[PDB]
Amino acid sequence: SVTCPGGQSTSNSQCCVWFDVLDDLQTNFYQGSKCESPVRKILRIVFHDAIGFSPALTAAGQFGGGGADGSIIAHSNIELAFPANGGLTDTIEALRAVGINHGVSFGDLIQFATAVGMSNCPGSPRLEFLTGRSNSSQPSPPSLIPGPGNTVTAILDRMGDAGFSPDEVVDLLAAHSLASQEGLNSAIFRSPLDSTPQVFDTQFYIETLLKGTTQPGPSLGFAEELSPFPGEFRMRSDALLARDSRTACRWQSMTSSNEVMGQRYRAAMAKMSVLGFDRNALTDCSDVIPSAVSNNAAPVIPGGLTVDDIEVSCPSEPFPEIATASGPLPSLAPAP
Ligand code: HEM
Ligand SMILES: *[C@@H]1O[C@H](CO)[C@@H](O[C@@H]2O[C@H](CO)[C@@H](O)[C@H](O)[C@H]2NC(C)=O)[C@H](O)[C@H]1NC(C)=O
Ligand SMILES: *[C@H]1O[C@H](CO)[C@@H](O)[C@H](O)[C@@H]1O
Ligand SMILES: [Ca+2]
Ligand SMILES: [Ca+2]
Numbered sequence: 001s002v003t004c005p006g007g008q009s010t011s012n013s014q015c016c017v018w019f020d021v022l023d024d025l026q027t028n029f030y031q032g033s034k035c036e037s038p039v040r041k042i043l044r045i046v047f048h049d050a051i052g053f054s055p056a057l058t059a060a061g062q063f064g065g066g067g068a069d070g071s072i073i074a075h076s077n078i079e080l081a082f083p084a085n086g087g088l089t090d091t092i093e094a095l096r097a098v099g100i101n102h103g104v105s106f107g108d109l110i111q112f113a114t115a116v117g118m119s120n121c122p123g124s125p126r127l128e129f130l131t132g133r134s135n136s137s138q139p140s141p142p143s144l145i146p147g148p149g150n151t152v153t154a155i156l157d158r159m160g161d162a163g164f165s166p167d168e169v170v171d172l173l174a175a176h177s178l179a180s181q182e183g184l185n186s187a188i189f190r191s192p193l194d195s196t197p198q199v200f201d202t203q204f205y206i207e208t209l210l211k212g213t214t215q216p217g218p219s220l221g222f223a224e225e226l227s228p229f230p231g232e233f234r235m236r237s238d239a240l241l242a243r244d245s246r247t248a249c250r251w252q253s254m255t256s257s258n259e260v261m262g263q264r265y266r267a268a269m270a271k272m273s274v275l276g277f278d279r280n281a282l283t284d285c286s287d288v289i290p291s292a293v294s295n296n297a298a299p300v301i302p303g304g305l306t307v308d309d310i311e312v313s314c315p316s317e318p319f320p321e322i323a324t325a326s327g328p329l330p331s332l333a334p335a336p
Contacts, residue, residue: 071137132282
């Protein structure tokens with residue numbers, strides 16, 4: 001409809017500024033449209049920006065947080081002191097500069113960079129992108145980000161307050177398909193959470209269900225559990241959620257279909273993206289977000305393990321027929 005200066009066809013002139021933000025992020029922040037540490041850090045940031053939203057605090061006479069409001073950037077001095085916000089300041093500063101240079105709100109930028117980053121990762125769905133969130137924010141209250149040592153009850157209660165059902169918690173955790181740790185165990189920096197940290201696929205759900213046999217580092221870090229093979233890190237929250245009766249059937253249903261996983265994640269991310277906002281007051285610029293390269297690989301149980309190594313935790317559904325591989329066990333390289 002609208003033609004931006006660049007030749008760029010879009011739905012609304014409010015989308016035109018985002019083509020320049022796209023180019024900048026793809027060249028610079030993403031270092032040539034790659035799916036590496038910048039994407040992974042941005043996914044932590046989108047979650048930790050949005051989840052600072054608590055109707056229970058509002059109901060108890062207190063500021064509950066503004067949700068997807070960019071507060072993690074605007075008020076980084078306060079929020080990057082939270083336990084869950086370590087290892088993010090360098091990324092936050094990069095985003096701060098992009099936001100100021102292009103004159104876009106910090107809340108919108110985080111959501112945009114999320115959709116753009118996802119688009120660089122094979123197999124990703126096309127995330128929605130809406131523009132118009134006010135740049136104004138107050139600091140998030142403390143203690144709103146679920147931690148990897150939290151019980152399943154605590155995680156579901158916190159996520160629940162923010163607005164997510166147990167299914168949607170599982171759906172949002174598909175981001176751990178593009179993931180490593182740096183801050184839990186300093187001896188195995190960027191140890192992946194799944195065997196394909198640069199492919200948005202079901203491997204995370206499969207591999208967290210394997211029997212824990214392996215200590216990847218010389219000692220355990222915070223909230224670390226045994227993993228199924230060298231190089232892979234397993235955090236306690238993921239281990240527990242995979243196995244808990246409240247989340248295990250959804251977890252298991254993610255294992256065989258990249259396509260259903262992507263749909264569910266897209267829907268949950270759309271919901272998360274507007275905590276603290278009315279989506280109907282925003283402008284849809286989803287057309288700025290390109291599709292990702294498709295992922296042609298099939299789900300697999302790695303390394304000669306079989307379904308007998310899966311701790312099947314959904315008591316009503318058989319484990320899906322998933323291909324196995326040759327041994328021996330893999331050793332995961334650090335995520336790039
Ligand atoms: C039950 C809730 C969740 C908990 C307890 C949790 C916990 C963690 C922790 C402890 C790390 C490791 C950070 C480090 O040491 O470097 C991690 C990494 C990561 N998380 Fe989560 N997370 C959760 C949900 C999510 C959600 C909803 C998203 C985003 C949609 C997300 C995206 C990621 C990504 C992409 C990484 C990898 C970062 C990297 O490779 O640098 N997480 N998460
Ligand atoms: C969004 O609000 C933040 C906070 O007021 C603004 O960030 C400041 O921007 C000025 C001017 O560019 C910089 O000198 C400060 O370093 C920034 N402070 C912080 C904490 O980042 C930002 O400019 C506002 N963005 C828009 C589009 O208005
Ligand atoms: C096996 O090999 C990988 C590197 O190829 C390591 O990342 C892992 O910790 C294990 O030594
Ligand atoms: Ca926030
Ligand atoms: Ca993966």
